[PDB]
């Protein structure tokens with residue numbers, strides 16, 4: 001069965017360290033760039049309100065067939081959901097799948113089952129992911145001073161915070177956050193960012209998001225293993241298309257000498273990915289994440 005990779009670094013900045021995100025990320029870089037990804041827990045009292053327009057939030061998530069590569073056009077037929085109705089679907093799926101309440105399923109069991117399903121020919125599990133929803137559609141999950149929604153006085157600090165993903169620097173010398181509504185086993189395959197950018201990711205609420213990261217010094221190693229083992233039909237494809245289908249069990253990479261680190265990101269925690277750090281992951285259950293690429 002699946003062997004979990006070693007844990008990536010988790011930082012718990014003091015209020016002083018938490019004052020300036022870019023300065024903090026610059027200070028942790030000597031360790032975090034050797035692991036590709038890191039997790040950042042804000043101070044206990046830092047709790048932004050959730051600011052999306054929940055009444056109107058509606059979307060059609062994309063269908064994900066976990067074993068689609070191993071299996072090598074009308075299978076499912078995706079409903080439109082609200083946040084509430086997607087959550088009911090997601091929780092019913094997971095509690096039915098594991099025969100237990102959703103909060104009682106061990107994170108290690110979901111992880112082992114996910115990778116078993118990805119390689120399974122005998123069982124075809126299909127899930128849905130509300131992925132790549134623009135923050136322009138119904139707003140960011142962070143409060144923003146654009147006069148579209150009311151900001152209470154207690155929330156203004158969060159609208160002005162440098163850790164609000166809307167306030168991260170995005171202009172490179174010579175771009176808004178995206179939202180992800182997850183359910184159990186919804187996933188993202190191995191990729192790096194455009195322009196080898198940093199990215200920052202915040203889990204607003206819900207069950208954890210499980211991550212795998214590879215430090216940039218091993219980017220070429222990972223790409224070589226991919227070419228050796230990815231389907232040939234897709235191996236010859238340019239990277240920006242191959243990255244749509246680069247699903248690979250972390251233990252395969254590890255057997256080929258590629259360093260891989262993991263983490264479970266819980267509600268209210270950040271994950272930072274460093275330049276050219278390949279990353280992949282899946283969701284443990286119903287959750288809501290926001291992500292943006294940023295410039296230093």
Ligand SMILES: O=C(O)c1ccncc1Nc1nn(CCN2CCC(F)(F)CC2)c2ccc(F)cc12
Nearest residue numbers: 129131132180187188191201209240243244289291
């Ligand atoms: O789901 C997450 O939490 C997540 C975290 C970090 N990075 C990416 C994440 N998800 C996804 N990102 N993109 C796209 C963005 N990025 C550029 C474009 C690319 F080349 F496809 C390669 C991924 C998807 C697309 C579909 C999907 F189901 C899922 C994602």
Ligand SMILES: [Mn+2]
Nearest residue numbers: 192193199279
């Ligand atoms: Mn990414």
